[PDB]
């Protein structure tokens, strides 16, 4: 009984080891009060840009 | 006019604005007899953001 139990358990353990459980997700977020992209202003003769 | 509009959830519109206006400099209109000149406006440049 003891030997069967220990063997079966140790085989089950290495068999299930390929299961992948860590996963990535995508979150969408709208800005309400500002422009999302890097922002250009044109001065009289020149563009200048803010991150 | 050059413009870029944005909707804000408060029911407000935000615009990036470039405005240029005026009339062409004309030394050639040498005449005195036309004191009834077409009205001399200036020339003006503005760039800004407003909400």
The DSSP secondary structure of A1-51, one letter per residue, reads -HHHHHHHHHHHHHHGGG-------------SSS-SS-EEEE-SS-EEEE-
Q: What is the resolution of this structure in A?
A: 3.3
From residue B2, give the alpha-carbon distance in Å to each of A19, A42, A43, B20. 57, 11, 14, 9
Query: Do B18 and A44 count as a contact with CB atoms less than 8 A apart?
Result: no
Q: For A15, phi and psi rounded to 5 degrees?
A: -60, -50
In Å, how far is A30's CA from the nearest CA of chain B? Answer: 11
Task: Name the residue among A32, A43, A44 with its Cβ closest to that of B9.
Answer: A32
Q: Chain A residue closest to B49 (CA)?
A: A41
In this complex, do A41 and B45 lie within 8 Å of one another by their Cβ atoms?
A: no
Q: How was this structure determined?
A: cryo-EM
Residue A2 phi/psi, 5-degree rounding, is -55, -50
């Amino acid at each position: 009984y003891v030997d069967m139990v220990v063997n079966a358990a140790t085989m089950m353990d290495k068999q299930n080891d390929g299961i992948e459980l860590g996963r990535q997700k995508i979150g969408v977020m709208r800005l309400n009060n500002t422009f999302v992209g890097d922002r250009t202003y044109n001065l009289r003769d020149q563009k200048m840009v803010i991150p | 006019i050059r413009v870029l509009p944005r909707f804000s959830a408060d029911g407000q519109i935000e615009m990036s604005l470039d405005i240029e206006d005026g009339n062409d400099k004309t030394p050639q209109s040498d005449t005195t007899t036309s004191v009834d000149a077409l009205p001399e406006v200036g020339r003006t440049l503005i760039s800004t953001i407003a909400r």
